[PDB]
PDB file of all heavy atoms in Angstrom:
ATOM      1  N   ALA A   1      95.218  97.259 126.319  1.00 21.98           N
ATOM      2  CA  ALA A   1      94.432  98.231 127.058  1.00 21.98           C
ATOM      3  C   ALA A   1      93.777  97.584 128.313  1.00 21.98           C
ATOM      4  O   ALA A   1      93.762  98.201 129.404  1.00 21.98           O
ATOM      5  CB  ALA A   1      93.376  98.871 126.140  1.00 21.98           C
ATOM      6  N   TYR A   2      93.298  96.360 128.172  1.00 22.45           N
ATOM      7  CA  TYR A   2      92.698  95.637 129.285  1.00 22.45           C
ATOM      8  C   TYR A   2      93.678  95.469 130.443  1.00 22.45           C
ATOM      9  O   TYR A   2      93.297  95.464 131.616  1.00 22.45           O
ATOM     10  CB  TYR A   2      92.185  94.297 128.789  1.00 22.45           C
ATOM     11  CG  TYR A   2      91.399  93.469 129.742  1.00 22.45           C
ATOM     12  CD1 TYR A   2      90.179  93.894 130.280  1.00 22.45           C
ATOM     13  CD2 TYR A   2      91.815  92.191 130.052  1.00 22.45           C
ATOM     14  CE1 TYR A   2      89.465  93.095 131.097  1.00 22.45           C
ATOM     15  CE2 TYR A   2      91.111  91.400 130.897  1.00 22.45           C
ATOM     16  CZ  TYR A   2      89.913  91.847 131.411  1.00 22.45           C
ATOM     17  OH  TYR A   2      89.117  91.078 132.245  1.00 22.45           O
ATOM     18  N   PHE A   3      94.959  95.329 130.111  1.00 21.60           N
ATOM     19  CA  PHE A   3      96.033  95.120 131.095  1.00 21.60           C
ATOM     20  C   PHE A   3      96.846  96.362 131.362  1.00 21.60           C
ATOM     21  O   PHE A   3      98.002  96.319 131.852  1.00 21.60           O
ATOM     22  CB  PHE A   3      96.928  93.978 130.561  1.00 21.60           C
ATOM     23  CG  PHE A   3      96.194  92.659 130.437  1.00 21.60           C
ATOM     24  CD1 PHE A   3      96.293  91.888 129.267  1.00 21.60           C
ATOM     25  CD2 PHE A   3      95.392  92.146 131.465  1.00 21.60           C
ATOM     26  CE1 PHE A   3      95.624  90.650 129.166  1.00 21.60           C
ATOM     27  CE2 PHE A   3      94.720  90.948 131.378  1.00 21.60           C
ATOM     28  CZ  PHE A   3      94.866  90.166 130.204  1.00 21.60           C
ATOM     29  N   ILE A   4      96.228  97.506 131.081  1.00 22.48           N
ATOM     30  CA  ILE A   4      96.898  98.800 131.283  1.00 22.48           C
ATOM     31  C   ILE A   4      97.444  99.014 132.725  1.00 22.48           C
ATOM     32  O   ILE A   4      98.413  99.814 132.917  1.00 22.48           O
ATOM     33  CB  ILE A   4      95.960  99.965 130.907  1.00 22.48           C
ATOM     34  CG1 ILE A   4      96.773 101.251 130.673  1.00 22.48           C
ATOM     35  CG2 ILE A   4      94.819 100.119 131.952  1.00 22.48           C
ATOM     36  CD1 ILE A   4      95.949 102.392 130.030  1.00 22.48           C
ATOM     37  N   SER A   5      96.920  98.304 133.705  1.00 24.10           N
ATOM     38  CA  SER A   5      97.436  98.466 135.072  1.00 24.10           C
ATOM     39  C   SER A   5      98.960  98.147 135.182  1.00 24.10           C
ATOM     40  O   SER A   5      99.583  98.605 136.119  1.00 24.10           O
ATOM     41  CB  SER A   5      96.672  97.651 136.104  1.00 24.10           C
ATOM     42  OG  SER A   5      96.871  96.255 135.952  1.00 24.10           O
ATOM     43  N   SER A   6      99.461  97.353 134.259  1.00 17.80           N
ATOM     44  CA  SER A   6     100.899  97.014 134.223  1.00 17.80           C
ATOM     45  C   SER A   6     101.791  98.071 133.637  1.00 17.80           C
ATOM     46  O   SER A   6     103.003  97.867 133.600  1.00 17.80           O
ATOM     47  CB  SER A   6     101.084  95.707 133.452  1.00 17.80           C
ATOM     48  OG  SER A   6     100.564  94.611 134.220  1.00 17.80           O
ATOM     49  N   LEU A   7     101.196  99.220 133.245  1.00 17.58           N
ATOM     50  CA  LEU A   7     101.934 100.355 132.694  1.00 17.58           C
ATOM     51  C   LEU A   7     101.823 101.580 133.577  1.00 17.58           C
ATOM     52  O   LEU A   7     100.776 101.892 134.139  1.00 17.58           O
ATOM     53  CB  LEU A   7     101.405 100.715 131.299  1.00 17.58           C
ATOM     54  CG  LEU A   7     101.561  99.585 130.244  1.00 17.58           C
ATOM     55  CD1 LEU A   7     101.032 100.008 128.863  1.00 17.58           C
ATOM     56  CD2 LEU A   7     102.997  99.137 130.106  1.00 17.58           C
ATOM     57  N   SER A   8     102.924 102.366 133.631  1.00 21.30           N
ATOM     58  CA  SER A   8     102.876 103.642 134.264  1.00 21.30           C
ATOM     59  C   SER A   8     102.018 104.609 133.427  1.00 21.30           C
ATOM     60  O   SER A   8     101.722 104.362 132.278  1.00 21.30           O
ATOM     61  CB  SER A   8     104.290 104.195 134.415  1.00 21.30           C
ATOM     62  OG  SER A   8     104.772 104.642 133.165  1.00 21.30           O
ATOM     63  N   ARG A   9     101.692 105.745 134.031  1.00 20.02           N
ATOM     64  CA  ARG A   9     100.947 106.794 133.304  1.00 20.02           C
ATOM     65  C   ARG A   9     101.668 107.182 132.029  1.00 20.02           C
ATOM     66  O   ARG A   9     101.068 107.277 130.953  1.00 20.02           O
ATOM     67  CB  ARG A   9     100.681 108.008 134.228  1.00 20.02           C
ATOM     68  CG  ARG A   9      99.641 108.977 133.668  1.00 20.02           C
ATOM     69  CD  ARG A   9      99.452 110.224 134.509  1.00 20.02           C
ATOM     70  NE  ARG A   9      98.899 109.947 135.836  1.00 20.02           N
ATOM     71  CZ  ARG A   9      97.608 109.863 136.190  1.00 20.02           C
ATOM     72  NH1 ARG A   9      96.627 110.022 135.307  1.00 20.02           N
ATOM     73  NH2 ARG A   9      97.294 109.602 137.460  1.00 20.02           N
ATOM     74  N   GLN A  10     102.988 107.402 132.121  1.00 20.32           N
ATOM     75  CA  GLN A  10     103.716 107.758 130.912  1.00 20.32           C
ATOM     76  C   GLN A  10     103.764 106.632 129.889  1.00 20.32           C
ATOM     77  O   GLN A  10     103.586 106.888 128.694  1.00 20.32           O
ATOM     78  CB  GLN A  10     105.120 108.278 131.219  1.00 20.32           C
ATOM     79  CG  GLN A  10     105.815 108.830 129.964  1.00 20.32           C
ATOM     80  CD  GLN A  10     105.060 110.031 129.328  1.00 20.32           C
ATOM     81  OE1 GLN A  10     104.658 110.990 130.017  1.00 20.32           O
ATOM     82  NE2 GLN A  10     104.847 109.954 128.008  1.00 20.32           N
ATOM     83  N   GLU A  11     103.956 105.385 130.349  1.00 20.97           N
ATOM     84  CA  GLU A  11     103.975 104.258 129.398  1.00 20.97           C
ATOM     85  C   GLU A  11     102.609 104.102 128.739  1.00 20.97           C
ATOM     86  O   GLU A  11     102.543 103.810 127.519  1.00 20.97           O
ATOM     87  CB  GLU A  11     104.395 102.966 130.061  1.00 20.97           C
ATOM     88  CG  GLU A  11     105.820 102.906 130.498  1.00 20.97           C
ATOM     89  CD  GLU A  11     106.106 101.722 131.432  1.00 20.97           C
ATOM     90  OE1 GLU A  11     105.242 101.373 132.256  1.00 20.97           O
ATOM     91  OE2 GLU A  11     107.234 101.168 131.342  1.00 20.97           O
ATOM     92  N   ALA A  12     101.534 104.336 129.492  1.00 20.89           N
ATOM     93  CA  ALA A  12     100.180 104.241 128.931  1.00 20.89           C
ATOM     94  C   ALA A  12      99.968 105.346 127.893  1.00 20.89           C
ATOM     95  O   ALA A  12      99.437 105.121 126.788  1.00 20.89           O
ATOM     96  CB  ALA A  12      99.105 104.265 130.067  1.00 20.89           C
ATOM     97  N   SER A  13     100.431 106.546 128.229  1.00 20.48           N
ATOM     98  CA  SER A  13     100.286 107.657 127.306  1.00 20.48           C
ATOM     99  C   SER A  13     101.063 107.323 126.028  1.00 20.48           C
ATOM    100  O   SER A  13     100.617 107.568 124.929  1.00 20.48           O
ATOM    101  CB  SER A  13     100.827 108.921 127.960  1.00 20.48           C
ATOM    102  OG  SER A  13     100.721 110.006 127.077  1.00 20.48           O
ATOM    103  N   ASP A  14     102.250 106.750 126.171  1.00 16.61           N
ATOM    104  CA  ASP A  14     103.056 106.477 124.974  1.00 16.61           C
ATOM    105  C   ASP A  14     102.417 105.390 124.094  1.00 16.61           C
ATOM    106  O   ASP A  14     102.458 105.465 122.851  1.00 16.61           O
ATOM    107  CB  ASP A  14     104.505 106.149 125.377  1.00 16.61           C
ATOM    108  CG  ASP A  14     105.269 107.376 125.921  1.00 16.61           C
ATOM    109  OD1 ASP A  14     104.858 108.539 125.775  1.00 16.61           O
ATOM    110  OD2 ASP A  14     106.333 107.156 126.525  1.00 16.61           O
ATOM    111  N   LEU A  15     101.879 104.361 124.726  1.00 16.17           N
ATOM    112  CA  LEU A  15     101.162 103.269 124.022  1.00 16.17           C
ATOM    113  C   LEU A  15      99.967 103.787 123.243  1.00 16.17           C
ATOM    114  O   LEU A  15      99.811 103.513 122.044  1.00 16.17           O
ATOM    115  CB  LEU A  15     100.724 102.216 125.008  1.00 16.17           C
ATOM    116  CG  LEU A  15      99.828 101.119 124.416  1.00 16.17           C
ATOM    117  CD1 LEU A  15     100.586 100.329 123.374  1.00 16.17           C
ATOM    118  CD2 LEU A  15      99.194 100.249 125.525  1.00 16.17           C
ATOM    119  N   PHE A  16      99.152 104.604 123.893  1.00 15.47           N
ATOM    120  CA  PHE A  16      97.943 105.137 123.260  1.00 15.47           C
ATOM    121  C   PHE A  16      98.257 106.214 122.190  1.00 15.47           C
ATOM    122  O   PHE A  16      97.567 106.259 121.187  1.00 15.47           O
ATOM    123  CB  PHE A  16      96.992 105.699 124.326  1.00 15.47           C
ATOM    124  CG  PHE A  16      96.064 104.682 124.863  1.00 15.47           C
ATOM    125  CD1 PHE A  16      96.547 103.657 125.642  1.00 15.47           C
ATOM    126  CD2 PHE A  16      94.740 104.698 124.507  1.00 15.47           C
ATOM    127  CE1 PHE A  16      95.656 102.663 126.105  1.00 15.47           C
ATOM    128  CE2 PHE A  16      93.903 103.716 124.935  1.00 15.47           C
ATOM    129  CZ  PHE A  16      94.397 102.704 125.732  1.00 15.47           C
ATOM    130  N   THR A  17      99.331 106.992 122.412  1.00 13.02           N
ATOM    131  CA  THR A  17      99.781 108.014 121.465  1.00 13.02           C
ATOM    132  C   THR A  17     100.251 107.322 120.191  1.00 13.02           C
ATOM    133  O   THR A  17      99.927 107.751 119.116  1.00 13.02           O
ATOM    134  CB  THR A  17     100.857 108.929 122.034  1.00 13.02           C
ATOM    135  OG1 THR A  17     100.333 109.629 123.165  1.00 13.02           O
ATOM    136  CG2 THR A  17     101.312 109.952 121.015  1.00 13.02           C
ATOM    137  N   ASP A  18     100.995 106.230 120.335  1.00 14.29           N
ATOM    138  CA  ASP A  18     101.493 105.501 119.146  1.00 14.29           C
ATOM    139  C   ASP A  18     100.297 104.988 118.319  1.00 14.29           C
ATOM    140  O   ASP A  18     100.249 105.142 117.083  1.00 14.29           O
ATOM    141  CB  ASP A  18     102.354 104.329 119.614  1.00 14.29           C
ATOM    142  CG  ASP A  18     102.813 103.429 118.426  1.00 14.29           C
ATOM    143  OD1 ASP A  18     103.744 103.866 117.702  1.00 14.29           O
ATOM    144  OD2 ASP A  18     102.228 102.383 118.254  1.00 14.29           O
ATOM    145  N   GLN A  19      99.282 104.443 119.003  1.00 16.08           N
ATOM    146  CA  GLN A  19      98.128 103.924 118.350  1.00 16.08           C
ATOM    147  C   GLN A  19      97.351 105.044 117.658  1.00 16.08           C
ATOM    148  O   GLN A  19      96.898 104.922 116.542  1.00 16.08           O
ATOM    149  CB  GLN A  19      97.288 103.150 119.327  1.00 16.08           C
ATOM    150  CG  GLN A  19      96.140 102.334 118.688  1.00 16.08           C
ATOM    151  CD  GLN A  19      96.577 101.129 117.813  1.00 16.08           C
ATOM    152  OE1 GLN A  19      95.750 100.562 117.113  1.00 16.08           O
ATOM    153  NE2 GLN A  19      97.820 100.682 117.945  1.00 16.08           N
ATOM    154  N   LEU A  20      97.197 106.184 118.330  1.00 19.29           N
ATOM    155  CA  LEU A  20      96.473 107.322 117.759  1.00 19.29           C
ATOM    156  C   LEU A  20      97.144 107.774 116.460  1.00 19.29           C
ATOM    157  O   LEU A  20      96.477 108.031 115.449  1.00 19.29           O
ATOM    158  CB  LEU A  20      96.456 108.493 118.730  1.00 19.29           C
ATOM    159  CG  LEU A  20      95.878 109.785 118.161  1.00 19.29           C
ATOM    160  CD1 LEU A  20      94.343 109.650 118.094  1.00 19.29           C
ATOM    161  CD2 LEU A  20      96.382 110.969 118.932  1.00 19.29           C
ATOM    162  N   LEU A  21      98.476 107.919 116.480  1.00 16.96           N
ATOM    163  CA  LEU A  21      99.141 108.451 115.291  1.00 16.96           C
ATOM    164  C   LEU A  21      98.969 107.490 114.108  1.00 16.96           C
ATOM    165  O   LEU A  21      98.755 107.928 112.939  1.00 16.96           O
ATOM    166  CB  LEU A  21     100.625 108.762 115.592  1.00 16.96           C
ATOM    167  CG  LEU A  21     100.870 109.933 116.592  1.00 16.96           C
ATOM    168  CD1 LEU A  21     102.299 110.423 116.438  1.00 16.96           C
ATOM    169  CD2 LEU A  21      99.880 111.113 116.493  1.00 16.96           C
ATOM    170  N   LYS A  22      99.061 106.205 114.389  1.00 18.75           N
ATOM    171  CA  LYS A  22      98.847 105.220 113.345  1.00 18.75           C
ATOM    172  C   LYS A  22      97.412 105.220 112.813  1.00 18.75           C
ATOM    173  O   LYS A  22      97.208 105.052 111.603  1.00 18.75           O
ATOM    174  CB  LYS A  22      99.193 103.820 113.821  1.00 18.75           C
ATOM    175  CG  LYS A  22     100.686 103.639 113.943  1.00 18.75           C
ATOM    176  CD  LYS A  22     101.030 102.415 114.716  1.00 18.75           C
ATOM    177  CE  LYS A  22     102.532 102.191 114.731  1.00 18.75           C
ATOM    178  NZ  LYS A  22     102.847 101.253 115.788  1.00 18.75           N
ATOM    179  N   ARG A  23      96.426 105.321 113.696  1.00 14.69           N
ATOM    180  CA  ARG A  23      95.041 105.348 113.264  1.00 14.69           C
ATOM    181  C   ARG A  23      94.713 106.644 112.477  1.00 14.69           C
ATOM    182  O   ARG A  23      93.939 106.619 111.526  1.00 14.69           O
ATOM    183  CB  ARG A  23      94.092 105.202 114.454  1.00 14.69           C
ATOM    184  CG  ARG A  23      94.218 103.826 115.204  1.00 14.69           C
ATOM    185  CD  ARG A  23      93.250 102.812 114.798  1.00 14.69           C
ATOM    186  NE  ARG A  23      93.609 101.462 115.253  1.00 14.69           N
ATOM    187  CZ  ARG A  23      93.169 100.389 114.625  1.00 14.69           C
ATOM    188  NH1 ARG A  23      92.426 100.539 113.529  1.00 14.69           N
ATOM    189  NH2 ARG A  23      93.521  99.152 115.055  1.00 14.69           N
ATOM    190  N   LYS A  24      95.321 107.753 112.866  1.00 14.83           N
ATOM    191  CA  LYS A  24      95.104 109.016 112.111  1.00 14.83           C
ATOM    192  C   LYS A  24      95.665 108.895 110.706  1.00 14.83           C
ATOM    193  O   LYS A  24      95.102 109.440 109.734  1.00 14.83           O
ATOM    194  CB  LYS A  24      95.692 110.192 112.872  1.00 14.83           C
ATOM    195  CG  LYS A  24      94.775 110.673 114.020  1.00 14.83           C
ATOM    196  CD  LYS A  24      95.422 111.811 114.840  1.00 14.83           C
ATOM    197  CE  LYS A  24      95.015 113.210 114.458  1.00 14.83           C
ATOM    198  NZ  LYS A  24      95.130 114.092 115.694  1.00 14.83           N
ATOM    199  N   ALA A  25      96.794 108.217 110.588  1.00 15.13           N
ATOM    200  CA  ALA A  25      97.425 108.045 109.270  1.00 15.13           C
ATOM    201  C   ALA A  25      96.549 107.089 108.414  1.00 15.13           C
ATOM    202  O   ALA A  25      96.341 107.371 107.244  1.00 15.13           O
ATOM    203  CB  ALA A  25      98.839 107.522 109.417  1.00 15.13           C
ATOM    204  N   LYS A  26      96.036 106.039 108.997  1.00 14.85           N
ATOM    205  CA  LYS A  26      95.098 105.161 108.274  1.00 14.85           C
ATOM    206  C   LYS A  26      93.858 105.937 107.815  1.00 14.85           C
ATOM    207  O   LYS A  26      93.377 105.802 106.672  1.00 14.85           O
ATOM    208  CB  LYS A  26      94.686 103.977 109.095  1.00 14.85           C
ATOM    209  CG  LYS A  26      93.743 103.035 108.380  1.00 14.85           C
ATOM    210  CD  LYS A  26      93.504 101.804 109.204  1.00 14.85           C
ATOM    211  CE  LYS A  26      92.564 100.843 108.463  1.00 14.85           C
ATOM    212  NZ  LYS A  26      93.326 100.216 107.330  1.00 14.85           N
ATOM    213  N   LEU A  27      93.325 106.736 108.727  1.00 17.98           N
ATOM    214  CA  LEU A  27      92.195 107.579 108.406  1.00 17.98           C
ATOM    215  C   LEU A  27      92.476 108.497 107.246  1.00 17.98           C
ATOM    216  O   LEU A  27      91.666 108.658 106.334  1.00 17.98           O
ATOM    217  CB  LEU A  27      91.710 108.324 109.667  1.00 17.98           C
ATOM    218  CG  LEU A  27      90.545 109.296 109.475  1.00 17.98           C
ATOM    219  CD1 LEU A  27      89.310 108.584 108.937  1.00 17.98           C
ATOM    220  CD2 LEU A  27      90.276 110.026 110.831  1.00 17.98           C
ATOM    221  N   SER A  28      93.659 109.147 107.242  1.00 20.04           N
ATOM    222  CA  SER A  28      94.117 109.943 106.095  1.00 20.04           C
ATOM    223  C   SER A  28      94.107 109.213 104.775  1.00 20.04           C
ATOM    224  O   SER A  28      93.666 109.767 103.777  1.00 20.04           O
ATOM    225  CB  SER A  28      95.559 110.427 106.313  1.00 20.04           C
ATOM    226  OG  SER A  28      95.583 111.420 107.269  1.00 20.04           O
ATOM    227  N   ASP A  29      94.613 108.003 104.773  1.00 23.26           N
ATOM    228  CA  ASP A  29      94.613 107.158 103.589  1.00 23.26           C
ATOM    229  C   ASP A  29      93.172 106.849 103.114  1.00 23.26           C
ATOM    230  O   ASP A  29      92.881 106.916 101.891  1.00 23.26           O
ATOM    231  CB  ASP A  29      95.285 105.822 103.859  1.00 23.26           C
ATOM    232  CG  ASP A  29      96.782 105.925 104.146  1.00 23.26           C
ATOM    233  OD1 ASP A  29      97.376 106.998 103.888  1.00 23.26           O
ATOM    234  OD2 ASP A  29      97.347 104.912 104.656  1.00 23.26           O
ATOM    235  N   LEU A  30      92.290 106.537 104.065  1.00 21.53           N
ATOM    236  CA  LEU A  30      90.897 106.259 103.707  1.00 21.53           C
ATOM    237  C   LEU A  30      90.190 107.495 103.139  1.00 21.53           C
ATOM    238  O   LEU A  30      89.421 107.421 102.176  1.00 21.53           O
ATOM    239  CB  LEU A  30      90.116 105.736 104.891  1.00 21.53           C
ATOM    240  CG  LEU A  30      90.535 104.385 105.413  1.00 21.53           C
ATOM    241  CD1 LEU A  30      89.871 104.126 106.782  1.00 21.53           C
ATOM    242  CD2 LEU A  30      90.147 103.286 104.390  1.00 21.53           C
ATOM    243  N   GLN A  31      90.492 108.638 103.728  1.00 21.72           N
ATOM    244  CA  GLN A  31      89.951 109.884 103.230  1.00 21.72           C
ATOM    245  C   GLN A  31      90.434 110.165 101.785  1.00 21.72           C
ATOM    246  O   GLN A  31      89.663 110.684 100.979  1.00 21.72           O
ATOM    247  CB  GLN A  31      90.291 111.014 104.202  1.00 21.72           C
ATOM    248  CG  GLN A  31      89.774 112.427 103.790  1.00 21.72           C
ATOM    249  CD  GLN A  31      88.286 112.560 103.930  1.00 21.72           C
ATOM    250  OE1 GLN A  31      87.701 111.930 104.826  1.00 21.72           O
ATOM    251  NE2 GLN A  31      87.655 113.402 103.092  1.00 21.72           N
ATOM    252  N   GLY A  32      91.686 109.840 101.447  1.00 21.52           N
ATOM    253  CA  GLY A  32      92.201 109.863 100.069  1.00 21.52           C
ATOM    254  C   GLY A  32      91.420 108.980  99.109  1.00 21.52           C
ATOM    255  O   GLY A  32      91.030 109.411  98.012  1.00 21.52           O
ATOM    256  N   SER A  33      91.137 107.732  99.545  1.00 23.18           N
ATOM    257  CA  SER A  33      90.341 106.829  98.741  1.00 23.18           C
ATOM    258  C   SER A  33      88.929 107.331  98.550  1.00 23.18           C
ATOM    259  O   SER A  33      88.338 107.159  97.469  1.00 23.18           O
ATOM    260  CB  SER A  33      90.298 105.456  99.401  1.00 23.18           C
ATOM    261  OG  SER A  33      91.585 104.923  99.520  1.00 23.18           O
ATOM    262  N   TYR A  34      88.385 107.963  99.601  1.00 21.36           N
ATOM    263  CA  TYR A  34      87.028 108.537  99.579  1.00 21.36           C
ATOM    264  C   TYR A  34      86.935 109.698  98.581  1.00 21.36           C
ATOM    265  O   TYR A  34      86.055 109.783  97.745  1.00 21.36           O
ATOM    266  CB  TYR A  34      86.626 108.923 100.990  1.00 21.36           C
ATOM    267  CG  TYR A  34      85.269 109.523 101.070  1.00 21.36           C
ATOM    268  CD1 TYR A  34      84.132 108.747 100.918  1.00 21.36           C
ATOM    269  CD2 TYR A  34      85.123 110.885 101.289  1.00 21.36           C
ATOM    270  CE1 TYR A  34      82.867 109.360 100.950  1.00 21.36           C
ATOM    271  CE2 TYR A  34      83.883 111.477 101.344  1.00 21.36           C
ATOM    272  CZ  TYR A  34      82.775 110.717 101.165  1.00 21.36           C
ATOM    273  OH  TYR A  34      81.555 111.349 101.216  1.00 21.36           O
ATOM    274  N   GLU A  35      87.945 110.577  98.609  1.00 21.45           N
ATOM    275  CA  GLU A  35      87.974 111.681  97.661  1.00 21.45           C
ATOM    276  C   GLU A  35      88.126 111.212  96.216  1.00 21.45           C
ATOM    277  O   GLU A  35      87.581 111.825  95.308  1.00 21.45           O
ATOM    278  CB  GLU A  35      89.048 112.648  98.088  1.00 21.45           C
ATOM    279  CG  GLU A  35      88.645 113.326  99.372  1.00 21.45           C
ATOM    280  CD  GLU A  35      89.724 114.129 100.047  1.00 21.45           C
ATOM    281  OE1 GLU A  35      90.878 114.137  99.573  1.00 21.45           O
ATOM    282  OE2 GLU A  35      89.390 114.744 101.120  1.00 21.45           O
ATOM    283  N   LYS A  36      88.825 110.095  96.011  1.00 21.93           N
ATOM    284  CA  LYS A  36      88.998 109.551  94.667  1.00 21.93           C
ATOM    285  C   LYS A  36      87.650 109.034  94.163  1.00 21.93           C
ATOM    286  O   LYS A  36      87.239 109.247  93.006  1.00 21.93           O
ATOM    287  CB  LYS A  36      90.064 108.452  94.680  1.00 21.93           C
ATOM    288  CG  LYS A  36      90.277 107.794  93.351  1.00 21.93           C
ATOM    289  CD  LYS A  36      91.535 106.957  93.358  1.00 21.93           C
ATOM    290  CE  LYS A  36      91.722 106.335  92.029  1.00 21.93           C
ATOM    291  NZ  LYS A  36      90.787 105.230  91.733  1.00 21.93           N
ATOM    292  N   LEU A  37      86.972 108.318  95.035  1.00 21.77           N
ATOM    293  CA  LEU A  37      85.657 107.789  94.723  1.00 21.77           C
ATOM    294  C   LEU A  37      84.717 108.921  94.371  1.00 21.77           C
ATOM    295  O   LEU A  37      83.989 108.847  93.375  1.00 21.77           O
ATOM    296  CB  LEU A  37      85.108 106.964  95.876  1.00 21.77           C
ATOM    297  CG  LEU A  37      83.648 106.478  95.695  1.00 21.77           C
ATOM    298  CD1 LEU A  37      83.574 105.656  94.441  1.00 21.77           C
ATOM    299  CD2 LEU A  37      83.107 105.670  96.885  1.00 21.77           C
ATOM    300  N   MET A  38      84.747 109.968  95.186  1.00 21.44           N
ATOM    301  CA  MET A  38      83.780 111.022  95.038  1.00 21.44           C
ATOM    302  C   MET A  38      84.096 111.982  93.939  1.00 21.44           C
ATOM    303  O   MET A  38      83.251 112.793  93.565  1.00 21.44           O
ATOM    304  CB  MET A  38      83.543 111.740  96.379  1.00 21.44           C
ATOM    305  CG  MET A  38      83.130 110.800  97.483  1.00 21.44           C
ATOM    306  SD  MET A  38      81.518 110.027  97.152  1.00 21.44           S
ATOM    307  CE  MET A  38      80.483 111.458  97.367  1.00 21.44           C
ATOM    308  N   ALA A  39      85.288 111.858  93.340  1.00 20.00           N
ATOM    309  CA  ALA A  39      85.639 112.640  92.160  1.00 20.00           C
ATOM    310  C   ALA A  39      84.837 112.287  90.882  1.00 20.00           C
ATOM    311  O   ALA A  39      84.945 112.960  89.850  1.00 20.00           O
ATOM    312  CB  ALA A  39      87.142 112.591  91.920  1.00 20.00           C
ATOM    313  N   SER A  40      84.020 111.228  90.934  1.00 17.39           N
ATOM    314  CA  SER A  40      83.012 110.941  89.878  1.00 17.39           C
ATOM    315  C   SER A  40      81.987 112.085  89.689  1.00 17.39           C
ATOM    316  O   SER A  40      81.706 112.850  90.620  1.00 17.39           O
ATOM    317  CB  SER A  40      82.261 109.666  90.202  1.00 17.39           C
ATOM    318  OG  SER A  40      81.375 109.898  91.278  1.00 17.39           O
ATOM    319  N   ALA A  41      81.462 112.179  88.464  1.00 14.66           N
ATOM    320  CA  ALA A  41      80.519 113.241  88.074  1.00 14.66           C
ATOM    321  C   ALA A  41      79.141 113.035  88.708  1.00 14.66           C
ATOM    322  O   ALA A  41      78.525 113.986  89.231  1.00 14.66           O
ATOM    323  CB  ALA A  41      80.372 113.286  86.559  1.00 14.66           C
ATOM    324  N   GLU A  42      78.663 111.797  88.644  1.00 12.15           N
ATOM    325  CA  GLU A  42      77.306 111.475  89.037  1.00 12.15           C
ATOM    326  C   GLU A  42      77.148 111.526  90.565  1.00 12.15           C
ATOM    327  O   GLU A  42      77.910 110.813  91.294  1.00 12.15           O
ATOM    328  CB  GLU A  42      76.943 110.080  88.502  1.00 12.15           C
TER     329      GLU A  42
END
């Protein structure tokens, strides 16, 4: 990201889109773990 000047607008969009999709999927997994934790009674 610091060196983004070496990328075109489309290349930058593709780089950041790839990262977003991966982070959303990680977030989904964490939300699964969170729901498992919170399935406790107390």
